[PDB]
Amino acid sequence: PIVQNLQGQMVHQCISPRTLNAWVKVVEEKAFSPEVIPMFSALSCGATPQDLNTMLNTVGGHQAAMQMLKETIDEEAAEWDRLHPVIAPGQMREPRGSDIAGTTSTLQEQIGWMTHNPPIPVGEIYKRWIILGLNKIVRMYSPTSILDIRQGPKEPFRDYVDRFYKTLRAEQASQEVKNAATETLLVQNANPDCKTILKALGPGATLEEMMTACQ
Amino acid sequence: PIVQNLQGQMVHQCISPRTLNAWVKVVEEKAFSPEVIPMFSALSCGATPQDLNTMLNTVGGHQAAMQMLKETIDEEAAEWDRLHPVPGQMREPRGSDIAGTTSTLQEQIGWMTHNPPIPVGEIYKRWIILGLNKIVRMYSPTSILDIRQGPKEPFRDYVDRFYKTLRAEQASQEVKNAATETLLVQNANPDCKTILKALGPGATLEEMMTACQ
Amino acid sequence: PIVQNLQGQMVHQCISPRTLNAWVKVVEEKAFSPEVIPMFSALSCGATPQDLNTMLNTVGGHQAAMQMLKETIDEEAAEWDRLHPVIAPGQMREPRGSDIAGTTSTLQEQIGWMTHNPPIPVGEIYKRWIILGLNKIVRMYSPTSILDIRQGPKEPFRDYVDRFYKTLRAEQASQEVKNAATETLLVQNANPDCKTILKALGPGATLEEMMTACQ
Amino acid sequence: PIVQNLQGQMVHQCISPRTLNAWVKVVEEKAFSPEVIPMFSALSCGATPQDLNTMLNTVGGHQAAMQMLKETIDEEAAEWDRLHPVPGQMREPRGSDIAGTTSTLQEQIGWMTHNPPIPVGEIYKRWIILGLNKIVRMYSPTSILDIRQGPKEPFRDYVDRFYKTLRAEQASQEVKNAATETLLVQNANPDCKTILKALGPGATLEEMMTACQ
Amino acid sequence: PIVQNLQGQMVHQCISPRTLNAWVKVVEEKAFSPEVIPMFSALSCGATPQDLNTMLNTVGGHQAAMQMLKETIDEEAAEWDRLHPVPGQMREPRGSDIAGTTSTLQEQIGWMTHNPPIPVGEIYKRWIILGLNKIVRMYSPTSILDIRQGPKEPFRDYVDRFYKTLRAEQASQEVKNAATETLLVQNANPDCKTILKALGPGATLEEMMTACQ
Amino acid sequence: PIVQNLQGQMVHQCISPRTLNAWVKVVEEKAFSPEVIPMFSALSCGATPQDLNTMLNTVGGHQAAMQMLKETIDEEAAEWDRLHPVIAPGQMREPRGSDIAGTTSTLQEQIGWMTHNPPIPVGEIYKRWIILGLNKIVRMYSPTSILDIRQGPKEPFRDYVDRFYKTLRAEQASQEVKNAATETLLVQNANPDCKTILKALGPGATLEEMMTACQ
Ligand SMILES: [Cl-]
Ligand SMILES: [Cl-]
Ligand SMILES: [Cl-]
Ligand SMILES: [Cl-]
Ligand SMILES: [Cl-]
Ligand SMILES: [Cl-]
Ligand SMILES: [Cl-]
Ligand SMILES: [Cl-]
Ligand SMILES: [Cl-]
Ligand SMILES: [Cl-]
Ligand SMILES: [Cl-]
Ligand SMILES: [Cl-]
Ligand SMILES: [Cl-]
Ligand SMILES: [Cl-]
Ligand SMILES: [Cl-]
Ligand SMILES: [Cl-]
Ligand SMILES: [Cl-]
Ligand SMILES: [Cl-]
Ligand SMILES: [Cl-]
Ligand SMILES: [Cl-]
Ligand SMILES: [Cl-]
Ligand SMILES: [Cl-]
Ligand SMILES: [Cl-]
Ligand SMILES: [Cl-]
Ligand SMILES: [Cl-]
Ligand SMILES: [Cl-]
Ligand SMILES: [Cl-]
Ligand SMILES: [Cl-]
Ligand SMILES: [Cl-]
Ligand SMILES: [Cl-]
Ligand SMILES: [Cl-]
Ligand SMILES: [Cl-]
Ligand SMILES: [Cl-]
Ligand SMILES: [Cl-]
Ligand SMILES: [Cl-]
Ligand SMILES: [Cl-]
C-alpha cells in the first residue's frame, strides 16, 4: 500500500503477512457472502493496483468467480480507455485501463500516479472496478430470491426478518430498492398470526415496532 | 482511524486486520450481549465515519438488527439536520455526511482535524451506540421479574443472573444499586430471603452475598 | 493509554485489540483466581479512566462481581470527595471522585489531568480503587479456608504446600499475616509422618528445607 | 528485506517470524497450487537474494521440486552471465551473486541501494518464479480436455474445475477468455450445452453461468 | 521495560500483552523444567523490578515454588543490605527497593537511567534466577545415578535422558563434558558399553553416539 | 539483536516473544530435519551471542544434540583462540573464543564489538559455529542413507525423487557431491520401467525431463 511517513510524504509499504492471510482466510470461510466485500475493501486500504492483484491472485479455487471478475475488470478498463485515450524523457505517462488494473504498469509507475500532485488514484479506481465485479458475483451466487423468503408457521419473526434482509443485501438492493421490497413483501409474507398484528401498526411502523409486536 | 503518529501529528491510518477480525469475531461469538457495545466502542477508537461503516458492514448475518440500526441512524441524522441546516473551502456536514454515506474520507478527515474539530467520527459513533443499545434491549430474553433464586441455587449464581438480566434490560446504575434492597431480596429463595431480611436496610451487595453464602 | 512519543511528550493512544482480548480472555478462563489481578494491573499499564472502564465493561457475566466492584468504586470515590471538595475560562478543573472513575469526565479532561505538570494521576488513582474492589472479590470467591487445608495421608508435601499458599494468597494475606499462618498451621496440619520430620528442623527451617525433608 | 523506514531511508530489515512462518505454512497446506506463487511474491516483498534463499531453504520436503528450481536458477544465472560478463569500489554481479550463493548481504544491499540500483532481489525473484511456474505446471494433475461437466453437476462447479485446471496448466489469459466460447461449451453436459448453443456467440461467462443455472 | 526508542533515548514501556501471555503459557506448559529459566530471562529483557514482579505475580498455582522464591529474594535483599547500608535528590536502593516492594516505578527508572546506572532490574533478575534455579533442582525428579540405558533402548534416547537429568540436577558444564568418559559409559547397557570401552579415552560425545548407533 | 535506529546507528533490541516462541516451536515440531537450520539462521538475524545462547538454551529435550553442539562450539572457540591470542582504561578488549560464544563476555561487550568501526562481528562468528554444529547433528540424525533410497515397484517417480533429495540434503551434500550422487544413483535405483526410459534421455537429461518421462 501507500502510507504516510513521519515527514508527511506518501511512500510505498509492503503488503503485510497479516493482511495477506486475512483476505485468503475470509474467502476460504465465507466465499461470496455479502459481508466479504466490505472486508476486501478494508483489507485493501491504500492498496496499489499491484496489491489488489496480489489479493485476488492469492485466492485458490472459486476460479469461475475469479474469471468473471477479470471479465468485469476488462469491461471497466475498456470504458476507461474510451473516455481517456493516451513519451517525454523522465515524465509521467497517462495510464491505460490495463495500467490501472496493474497488468501493463510497474509498481513504481503506480506509486508515481498515486502520489502525484494531483494524484491519479489508480488504486482507488481499480478497487472500484473490482468491487463492481465482486458485487455481481455476490448477487449471482445468492442461494435465495427475496420472493421465496416467507415466514414459517412456527418461525420467530426475528429469524424471518434476518433471512429477508440477508437475501435483499445479497441483491445489492439500494435503500430505495430495499424499502420497496419491505413495503411489498415483509408484512405480506409474514405468517398469519404475525401478519394481522403488523397491519394494525400501519405503513409507518418501524421495523423495531414490527419486531416487538410479533415477538 | 485518525491517530497521532510518533511525531505529534494527527494522521489517517488504515483500520488494521487485527481490529477488523476482532470486531467480526466478537459479534460472531457474542451477538448483541451488552458487553459487545463497550468492545465496539474501544475497537472503533479514533474511527472515521468510513471506519465505523466498515465495521458495521463487515458483520454477516444479524441483518434484522443491522436494519434497525440503519433506521436509528437515519432518525439521528434527521435530528442533526433539523438542528444544523446547511472554492477550496470546507462545507458543513449533514447527517448523511456524519454517517459516512454522502461524505468522502478526505472530507471526514477535514472535519475531524479542523481547528476546532467537527468530530463526525464521535458523533456518528454515538448514534450507532444508541442503535446498538436498542438492539441489546430488544434481544434481551428475560424480564428481571422472572429471575428468581432456585431452592438450591447458590446465591452468587442467582445474583449473576439478576444483574446480567438487569444490564440487558438496561436499568440505570441507580436502579441497579437500588434493586439491592428491593427486588433482589424479593426474588431470593425462602431460606436466603429470611437471612437478608434480618440484615436490615442498607446492606451492601457484598454483605448480602456473604450472608447467603 | 498515555504513552511517550518521540519528542518526549505523553500523548493518548488507543487501547489495543490485543490488550482488549487478553483481558476478556483471562477473565473468561480464570475468573477471580488471584493471579488475574496482577494481569489486570499489567494490561492496564498507562490506562486512562476511560480505558479502565472499557476493560471492566467488556466483561460479560460475573455481574455480581462487577456490581460489587461498582459499589467499592463508589465508596472510594465518596471518600475522595470527602478529602478533596471541588470555572475559569480555558483552565483545568479539579476532578471529583466520579471524574476519576471516568463517568463524569471526558477523555480529554482525563488526558489533561494525567499529563499535567504536576500530573493528577487519575488513571493510577482509579486503578487503585478497582484493584481494592477486585481483591475483595478474589477473597470472597475463594473456595477454601486456610484452616481446612490439611495434608492428605498419601498427598505429597509439595502438593499440600501448593494448596496452602494458594489459599493464603486468595485471602490477601500480608507477609506478616502469611508468616503467622505458616507458623500456626503449616507443620501442625502436615500429615503425621511429615509432621514429625518438620518439628525436628525447628522454627527456623526454611520452606525449602521443609519441602526437602518431606519429599 | 530492504524497506524504507519511517524517515525515508532504504534500510535492511530482518525477515520477520510472521513472514517466515506464513511462507512455510502456505507450502505445507497448498504445496504448488498456482495461488502459492503470488503469495510467495508478496511475502518476499523487498527481499534481498539472501531473504529469497532463506524462504526457499526453510521449506522441508518437496525436494524434487526444490532441485528442479535450483536447476532453473542455474540456467537463468548462466543466461545472465552470457549477457553480463564481469579498492573500495563496487563489483558487478554474476548470476551466482544475484542468486545469493557467491555474494554477501552487504554486497547485495550495495547493489540494491545503488544509484541507479542493480535490483538483484527483483532479478532473482523473477528467476525463482519462473522455476515455481514450471513446478506448478508439472504437478498439475489434469488436462483441460478431461474436465467435463457431470450429468448432474452444477454448471458453477464445473466452471470452477475448468478454470482451476486451466490456471494450473497456465493457459494465457487470452486462452482463458477465448475458451469461454469454445472448449467450455464443448465439455458441458448435454442439457447445458444445448442452452449455451442457443445463447449464440459472444456470451460472457456471466451470461453462460446464468443460462445454465 | 526500559528500552531505547527509535530516536536513541532510554524510555519506559509497558510490558506487552504478548510478553505477559508468553510467560504465563510457558509456566503452564513447562512448570520448572530447566529451559523455562532462559525463557524467563529473555522475556524479561529490559525489565524494571516492577515488571519482574508482574511476571512472577501473573503465575497462578505453583505457590510453594513462588513462596520459596520469595524467601530466596529476601535472603538476597538482606545480603544486599549488609553490603550497601543506606530535597529533589536520588536515594540509594535497599534490597526491598531492588525487589520492587518498597520502591516506586519512577524511582526504579531513576536508578536504571542514572549516569552511571544502578541496574536494579538486572540485580533483581539475578536474585530471581538464583531462586528459580533452586526450584528447578528441587523439582528434578531423578538422580543421574538412576539414568541407565535399557537393554533395547537406542543410545541416542538414553543420552537425551542422561543430559536432561544432568541439566535439572544442574551439574556444571565441566561435569557435563567430564561425565562423557565416566558415568555416561558406566550406565550404558552391556552391548554399547563394550563398544564404548574399545573407543578408548578421549572419545567425543559424537564419536560415542556414532559408535553405539 | 542489533538493529538500525532512525538516526542510522546500530543499537541493541530485545529478542522478541514471537522470535522466542517461533524457534522453540520449530524444534518441538521438526527436531533436526534439515530445514530447521535455515529457520534458526533467519530467526537469529542480527543476534548477539547472548541472543544465540538464549535460543539454544530455551530448547528443552534433545539434550544429546545440545551437548554435541556445545562440544562443537568449544572446538571452534579453541581454534579461534589458537589463531587470535589475547587492559587500557575504558578501551575495547579483544574477544576470546568463549567471549564470542557469549559465556565470558557481557552483553555490552558484545554490542561494543558488533557495533565497532570496523565491527568484530561476534554474533555472526558464533552463529557460524552453531550452524556447523547443527549441520553435524542433522547429518547424524538422518534416518536414511542415500544408498538405501530405491524407487518402489509401484512408487511414483516424483515420490522417489523427493526421498532421494531429502536424504541427500540431510547429508550436507555440496552441489558437487549432490551431482555425483545423482549421476551415480538416481537412475540406477529407479525401478525397471522408469529406468529404461531415463537411460534413453542420456546423461544430459534435466531432472524436469526425467520426471516428465516417468510420470
Ligand atoms: Cl504482519
Ligand atoms: Cl464495499
Ligand atoms: Cl497468478
Ligand atoms: Cl507488477
Ligand atoms: Cl483521474
Ligand atoms: Cl425481537
Ligand atoms: Cl494487524
Ligand atoms: Cl459504550
Ligand atoms: Cl456493505
Ligand atoms: Cl467512503
Ligand atoms: Cl460540532
Ligand atoms: Cl459469594
Ligand atoms: Cl493489536
Ligand atoms: Cl496487583
Ligand atoms: Cl457498558
Ligand atoms: Cl468517556
Ligand atoms: Cl493527586
Ligand atoms: Cl519437593
Ligand atoms: Cl513478527
Ligand atoms: Cl506472481
Ligand atoms: Cl539449506
Ligand atoms: Cl549470505
Ligand atoms: Cl540491472
Ligand atoms: Cl451461478
Ligand atoms: Cl502485543
Ligand atoms: Cl538464564
Ligand atoms: Cl499478586
Ligand atoms: Cl509499584
Ligand atoms: Cl550498583
Ligand atoms: Cl545418533
Ligand atoms: Cl512479539
Ligand atoms: Cl543455513
Ligand atoms: Cl540454561
Ligand atoms: Cl550475558
Ligand atoms: Cl574478526
Ligand atoms: Cl511429475
Numbering used by the authors:
A (entry chain A), C (entry chain A), F (entry chain A): 1 to 86, 91 to 219
B (entry chain B), D (entry chain B), E (entry chain B): 1 to 86, 93 to 219
Question: What do the authors say?
Answer:
Lenacapavir (LEN) is a long-acting, highly potent HIV-1 capsid (CA) inhibitor. The evolution of viral variants under the genetic pressure of LEN identified Q67H, N74D, and Q67H/N74D CA substitutions as the main resistance associated mutations (RAMs). Here, we determined high-resolution structures of CA hexamers containing these RAMs in the absence and presence of LEN. High-resolution co-crystal structures of LEN in a complex with cross-linked CA hexamers revealed that the inhibitor binds in a hydrophobic pocket formed by two adjacent CA subunits.
To elucidate the structural basis for how the N74D CA change confers resistance to LEN, we have determined the X-ray crystal structures of cross-linked CA(N74D) hexamers in the absence and presence of LEN at 1.97 and 3.32 Å resolutions, respectively. The overall secondary structures of CA(N74D) and CA(N74D) + LEN are highly similar to those of their WT counterparts. Yet, the structure of the N74D mutant protein has not been reported previously. Here, we present X-ray crystal structures of CA hexamers containing the N74D substitution in the presence and absence of LEN, which reveal structural bases for both LEN resistance and deleterious effects of this CA substitution on CPSF6 and SEC24C binding. Asp74 can interact with the N61 of LEN via a water molecule, though these indirect inhibitor-protein contacts are likely to be substantially weaker than the direct hydrogen bonding between Asn74 and the sulfonamide group, as seen in the CA(WT) + LEN structure. Second, the N74D substitution results in a significantly more negative surface potential at this site, and its vicinity to the LEN binding site could adversely influence inhibitor binding (compare panels C and D in Fig. 3). Asp74 interacts with Lys70 in unliganded CA(Q67H/N74D) but not in the CA(N74D) structure. Superimposition of our apo CA(N74D) structure with the FG-motif containing peptides of CPSF6 and SEC24C bound cross-linked WT CA hexamers helps us to better understand how the N74D change compromises CA binding to these cellular proteins. In addition, the CA substitution would introduce electrostatic repulsions between the side chain oxygen of Asp74 and the main chain carbonyl oxygen of the Leu315 of CPSF6 or the Leu230 of SEC24C. Accordingly, the N74D change impairs CA binding to both CPSF6 and SEC24C.
